[PDB]
Amino acid sequence: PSSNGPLEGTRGKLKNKPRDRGTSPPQRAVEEFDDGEKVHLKIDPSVPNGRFHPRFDGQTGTVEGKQGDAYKVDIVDGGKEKTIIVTAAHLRRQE
Amino acid sequence: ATGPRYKVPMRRRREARTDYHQRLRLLKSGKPRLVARKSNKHVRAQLVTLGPNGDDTLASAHSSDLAEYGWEAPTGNMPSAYLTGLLAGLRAQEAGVEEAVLDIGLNSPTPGSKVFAIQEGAIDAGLDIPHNDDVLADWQRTRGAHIAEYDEQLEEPLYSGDFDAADLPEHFDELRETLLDGDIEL
Amino acid sequence: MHALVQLRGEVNMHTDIQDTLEMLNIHHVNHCTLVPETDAYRGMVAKVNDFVAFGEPSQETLETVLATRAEPLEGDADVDDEWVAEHTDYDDISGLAFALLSEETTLREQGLSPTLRLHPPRGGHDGVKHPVKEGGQLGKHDTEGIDDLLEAMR
Amino acid sequence: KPGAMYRNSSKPAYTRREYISGIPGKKIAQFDMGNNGAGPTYPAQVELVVEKPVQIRHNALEAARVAANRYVQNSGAAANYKFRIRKFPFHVIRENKDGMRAPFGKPVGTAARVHGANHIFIAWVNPDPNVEEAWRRAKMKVTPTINIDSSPAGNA
Amino acid sequence: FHEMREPRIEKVVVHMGIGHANAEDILGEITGQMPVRTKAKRTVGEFDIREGDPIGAKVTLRDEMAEEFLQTALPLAELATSQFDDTGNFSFGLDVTVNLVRPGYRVAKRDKASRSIPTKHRLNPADAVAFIESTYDVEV
RNA sequence: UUAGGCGGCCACAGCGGUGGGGUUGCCUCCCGUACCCAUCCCGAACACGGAAGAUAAGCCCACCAGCGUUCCGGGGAGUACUGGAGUGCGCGAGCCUCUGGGAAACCCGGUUCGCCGCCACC
RNA sequence: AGUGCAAGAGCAAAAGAUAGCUUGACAGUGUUCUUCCCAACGAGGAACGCUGACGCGAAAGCGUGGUCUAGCGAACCAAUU
RNA sequence: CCUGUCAAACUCCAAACUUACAGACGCCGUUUGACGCGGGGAUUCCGGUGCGCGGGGUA
Ligand SMILES: [Cl-]
Ligand SMILES: [Cl-]
Ligand SMILES: [Mg+2]
Ligand SMILES: [Mg+2]
Ligand SMILES: [Mg+2]
Ligand SMILES: [Mg+2]
Ligand SMILES: [Mg+2]
Ligand SMILES: [Mg+2]
Ligand SMILES: [Mg+2]
Ligand SMILES: [Mg+2]
Ligand SMILES: [Mg+2]
Ligand code: NA
Ligand code: NA
Ligand code: NA
Ligand code: NA
Ligand code: NA
Ligand code: NA
């Protein structure tokens, strides 16, 4: 990489297909999850806040409590355990 | 419409019926919404909750089924709104609903407006709702006084046949009084 | 149910490929195992496709090989009809064979090593640089094709 | 410089003029020859087909075209036929002309990438294939071996 | 069908596009109600570089205020045809524009469930000439 | 749902067009400014008060595929590309065989002129 | 289109424009991610909280500076609260 | 309308494939204690080649 900022090489993953462009539906930004639930991490290009580091796009973690309205999701980066602060807007129920 | 890349608004935005930015803010509270809506002739009040396939209305009141309790006056006015709010609020209470946030859809937050009257009613019914007292009408106007005085400048009945010639803010009291005890569907 | 025989060594073969053979209980060249025809097992043999010989053997052939190269989970003991009868659910090799072919049981389930340690092919095989359709010995075989290999390695 | 230096298609496609400046102009004079006023309303249609993917420098295109069309004057300056070279030299080519240090070359030309089996030239003629000859001379000035193919023409 | 299809005047805009005013006064008397400032956009050579800047006024008249005005405006104009909108409007003159449309226009001007008026229900140049011409004057 | 309100999915729902519908549950347009409220100017809008009129807009209902979109059949195509293997071919660039996957454009024919949830309601 | 400035991304009853008001560019203290994928490492940065005090709004709510990723600096010493 | 071509810093499309998590089979672990935790001791931080994919370069 020519630089090392968080958004380095995120042109694709943080861009919407032309038709999914524009404010996203509120339903999924208000979704409620319970501790223990499995959630898929995926930033919604249209929603600025509640994001996590792009490197974790695609992960599937375990909700374990929350902080404010945001959720605390536990994932395992390679072999390291990490806790991610993320809002519902960027989460989806597994299965 | 024009091509593959074209962006078509969400249906309720096309229909110019739902303000999604306000909606999200509303849903933040995590509380039920007190949906205050108006029509040229009527005023509706619903207590809506969030659902898997769409909203769920747990209690509602329409200015039309107000007569069902002794309403013999027009239904597109202030006194009408308040009562419809109180009615819906009561049914709300019966349903086990204790609090809600006021959703006035695409209407304007004008002081003394009917939506706020609806809000006042629901609150008095027992519903706990975030509000601001000096944005509401001064009781008398809610009673329908502004209209009675307007008919004082008579010369010709404000009401085409309807009921009374000089109107009745008293009819208002009789009804509120009624709603505050017993009766069916409450 | 297919018969699997490793015909190519470990040196230079992908690790994820070698681990697969190992999960199929084959850890040496000329070692054979019997595998049920399932989705899960099918994917495994496909991955191993280039270093092995496989196919559905005939009742007879299986019996010859079972008799000749079957072993107890532990020990020298010859697996003959009597052994089969005094140690398994079946009454003789044929009975076991049939059960294996109809995928009703497995060598382990009957207290036998999952591996049939074969002998080099008498007369030599068709080569390990080309598949069957090319005259080689790698890949899926005919029942008649597997039988010949198995019998030559009896 | 020799074609040996640029005939292979081993490098990335390099055609974005928004990020490349100083690109030499093309030596190819025309792409439509003959009676361009008329449309392919001819009985016979022969094509020069390249048999290997290669890069053809605008240099070779011009010499190949000239040698063919300049010859198609066995029919006359205003003869009845139309000649078309369908490819354009999009690929920008460099040269490192310090040693291997900071070697990214400077633009020295352009070339066209042709895949084996594509037709680089297409001529339209009435039963009067002098064009077949114009091409024996054309594939003479381009890197690859070529196939002279005739399409509408069962007049053998 | 008709009655709700017959044209009507919706606002008449009288504006004086000056280039920097004292002109409001006359607009107030010529119409009958306060004029509104006209800010301009973009910086330009006519020493008009100022973005927010009074550069004229306008007056939107509705109902009687519009008629009582046209009842003297029109007479001071001759033109017609070609000088008409494709939507049945027309501007003449100091400018005086007349916006014309049919009964259900509020549908496109309100906040809730607003909607664009269908081409069929739109007012044509012709259907416009008729209405007005049929009101104290002549076309072309 | 003989017309409503809040929505979920967010073009299968868009764009365009045709036909039908209202003494009333209704929604609208509509009529009107004493009030609450309102226009940097206008009761246009917003807000309030109201029914003389109308179904022409909207809206609801039925339908049309010309454009856009979704999915499907057949063709393109098991082509392009590709994970694994080869003492197969080729001066080479590169190609081929076996094995496991497998497209896009485009053409022709169907589909699509929304679906679903909660509440209210001759 | 615009949104201060690279490039890429986000944004339409707005994240843009206009008007008005306001000083949350607030004090204190944390959680987590980043810096440094995996995998230890400081300053710095960000996300998301809490406590306190405030601004605006009918209210839900928004405001931990600028829509997002650059704009930064140890110990010793000095000055300052 | 017709007709001729392209893209590492284009995309209406779009693989093979890589990858998070979960279940199943396999293999493995519960006297051979896996997975993991804590601690002691290093060596090492000139690498090279083949194949696939590369970027630079006439090579
Ligand atoms: Cl994060
Ligand atoms: Cl409403
Ligand atoms: Mg990329
Ligand atoms: Mg043993
Ligand atoms: Mg021998
Ligand atoms: Mg041999
Ligand atoms: Mg109609
Ligand atoms: Mg911010
Ligand atoms: Mg020092
Ligand atoms: Mg100092
Ligand atoms: Mg990769
Ligand atoms: Na979106
Ligand atoms: Na130098
Ligand atoms: Na040649
Ligand atoms: Na001003
Ligand atoms: Na209608
Ligand atoms: Na830090």
How many structural domains does chain A have?
1
Give the number of whichever ligand sits closest to the CA of residue A53: 1
C111, D92, D94, D96, D112 from D20: Cα distances, Å: 73, 8, 11, 16, 17
Nearest CA in chain B to E111: B106
Rg of chain A, C-alpha, whole Å: 14
SS3 E99: strand
Q: Could you write out the DSSP letters of every residue in D19-66?
A: T---PPPP----SEEE-TTS-S--SEEEEEEE-S-EEEEHHHHHHHHH
E36's enclosing H/E stretch is strand E36-37
Of the candidates A18, A19, A30, which has its C-beta nearest B50's C-beta? Answer: A30
SS3 E6: coil
Contacts of A27 in chain B (CB under 8 A): 50
Among candidate residues A28, A13, A20, the one with its CA nearest the CA of residue A88: A28
Please give the backbone phi and psi of residue E128, each rounded to the nearest 5 degrees, phi first. -85, -50
All structural domains of chain B with their residue ranges: 1-186
The fold of the B1-186 domain, in CATH, is Nucleotidyltransferase; domain 5 (3.30.420)
Physical contact, B and E (3 or more Cβ pairs within 8 A): yes
Total number of residues shown for chain E: 140
Q: B174 vs chain E: nearest CA distance in angstroms?
A: 34
Q: Cβ within 7 Å of strand F: which of B 165-184?
A: none
Q: Distance from the CA of C129 to the center of ligand 6, in angstroms? A: 8
SS3 D136: helix
Find out whether D43 and D126 touch, Cβ atoms under 8 Å.
yes
Q: For chain C, how far is it from start to end, CA to CA, in angstroms?
A: 19
Q: For chain E, how far is it from start to end, CA to CA, in angstroms?
A: 29
SS3 C148: helix
**Pairing between β-strand C52-55 and β-strand C139-140 as defined by DSSP bridges:** parallel
Nearest CA in chain E to B11: E113
- The residue whose two tokens read 């093309």 is D26
Q: Which nucleotides of strand G come closer than 7 angstroms to any CB of the protein?
A: 8-15, 18-19, 30-40, 47-50, 57-64, 67-70
* Residue A82 CA from chain centroid, whole number: 14
Q: Cβ within 7 Å of strand H: which of D 105-134?
A: 105, 112-114, 118
Q: Is B17–E113 a contact, with Cβ atoms under 8 angstroms apart?
A: yes
- Tokens coding B31: 């509380």
Contacts of B10 in chain A (CB under 8 A): 25
Physical contact, B and A (3 or more Cβ pairs within 8 A): yes
**Taking CA D44 as the corner, what is the angle to CA D39 and CA D46, rounded to the nearest 5 degrees?**
95
Helices (H), E46-136: 64-73, 125-133
**Taking CA C122 as the corner, what is the angle to CA C118 and CA C127, rounded to the nearest 5 degrees?**
90
E15's enclosing H/E stretch is strand E8-16
- B5 and chain A: CB distance < 8 Å anywhere? yes
For the domain spanning E1-140, the CATH number is: 3.30.1440.10
CB-defined contacts B:E, below 8 A: 13
Residues around the ion ligand 6 (C-beta < 5 A): C 127
HSE, CB side, 13 Å, CA atoms: give it for residue B136. 20
Give the separation between CA D120 and CA D58, rounded to whole angstroms: 13
Of the candidates B16, B107, B108, which has its C-beta nearest E113's C-beta? Answer: B16
D148's enclosing H/E stretch is strand D146-150
Give the separation between CA D73 and CA C152, rounded to whole angstroms: 75
Query: Looking at the domain covering D1-156, what would its CATH class be?
Result: alpha beta
Total number of residues shown for chain A: 95
SS3 E47: coil
Q: Is E113–B15 a contact, with Cβ atoms under 8 angstroms apart?
A: yes
Angle between helices C39-48 and C15-23 (to 10 degrees): 130
Q: What kind of experiment solved this structure? A: X-ray
All structural domains of chain E with their residue ranges: 1-140
Give the separation between CA B13 and CA B7, rounded to whole angstroms: 12
| Reported resolution, Å | 3.0
SS3 A73: strand
Find out whether B81 and B43 touch, Cβ atoms under 8 Å.
yes
- Spanning CA of B3 to C1' of H11, the rounded length in angstroms is 14
Find out whether D33 and D122 touch, Cβ atoms under 8 Å.
no
Beta bridge partners of A60: A40
Give the separation between CA A32 and CA A52, rounded to whole angstroms: 18
Q: Which nucleotide lies at the shortest CA–C1' distance from C109?
A: H26
Torsion of CA C19, C22, C27, C33, to 10 degrees: -140
Beta bridge partners of B65: none
- E112 and chain B: CB distance < 8 Å anywhere? yes
Q: Is E112–B15 a contact, with Cβ atoms under 8 angstroms apart?
A: no
The fold of the C58-113 domain, in CATH, is 3-methyladenine DNA Glycosylase II; Chain A, domain 3 (1.10.15)
CB-defined contacts A:B, below 8 A: 28
Please give the backbone phi and psi of residue E120, each rounded to the nearest 5 degrees, phi first. -65, -40
All structural domains of chain C with their residue ranges: 1-57+114-154, 58-113
Strand F contacted by B159 CB (< 7 A): yes
**Pairing between β-strand B101-103 and β-strand B33-38 as defined by DSSP bridges:** parallel
Q: Which nucleotide lies at the shortest CA–C1' distance from A56?
A: H20
Find out whether A77 and A84 touch, Cβ atoms under 8 Å.
no
Among candidate residues B145, B129, B125, B128, the one with its CA nearest the CA of residue B137: B145
Contacts of B30 in chain A (CB under 8 A): 30
Q: Is A26–B9 a contact, with Cβ atoms under 8 angstroms apart?
A: no
Q: Which nucleotide lies at the shortest CA–C1' distance from C39?
A: H25
Chains with at least 3 CB pairs less than 8 angstroms from chain A: B
- Tokens coding C12: 């230079």
Find out whether D145 and D52 touch, Cβ atoms under 8 Å.
yes
- Tokens coding D75: 């029919």
Q: Could you write out the DSSP letters of every residue in D57-114?
A: EHHHHHHHHHHHHTTSTTS-TT-S-EEEE-----EEEEE----SSS---EEEEEEEEE
What are the strands of the beta sheet with D119-125, ordered from one edge?
Answer: D32-34, D82-85, D119-125, D44-50, D146-150
C48's enclosing H/E stretch is helix C39-48
- Spanning CA of B22 to C1' of F44, the rounded length in angstroms is 26
Q: Which nucleotide lies at the shortest CA–C1' distance from B4?
A: H12
Q: Is A26–B24 a contact, with Cβ atoms under 8 angstroms apart?
A: yes
Give the separation between CA E12 and CA C95, rounded to whole angstroms: 104
Q: Cβ within 7 Å of strand H: which of A 30-59?
A: 38, 40, 58-59
Chains with at least 3 CB pairs less than 8 angstroms from chain E: B
CATH superfamily of C1-57+114-154: Ribosomal protein L30/L7 (3.30.1390.20)
Give the separation between CA A28 and CA A43, rounded to whole angstroms: 12
Q: Which nucleotides of strand H come closer than 7 angstroms to any CB of the protein?
A: 2, 4-10, 12-13, 19-22, 24-27, 36, 54-59
Neighbours of B80 (CB within 10 A): 26
Give the separation between CA C153 and CA C117, rounded to whole angstroms: 9
Q: Could you write out the DSSP letters of every residue in chain C?
A: -EEEEE-S-STTS-HHHHHHHHHTT--STTEEEEE---HHHHHHHHHHGGGEEEEPPPHHHHHHHHHHH--BSSSS----HHHHHHHSSSSSHHHHHHHHHTTS--TTTTTB-S-EEPPPPTT--S-SSSBGGGTSSBEE--HHHHHHHHHHT-
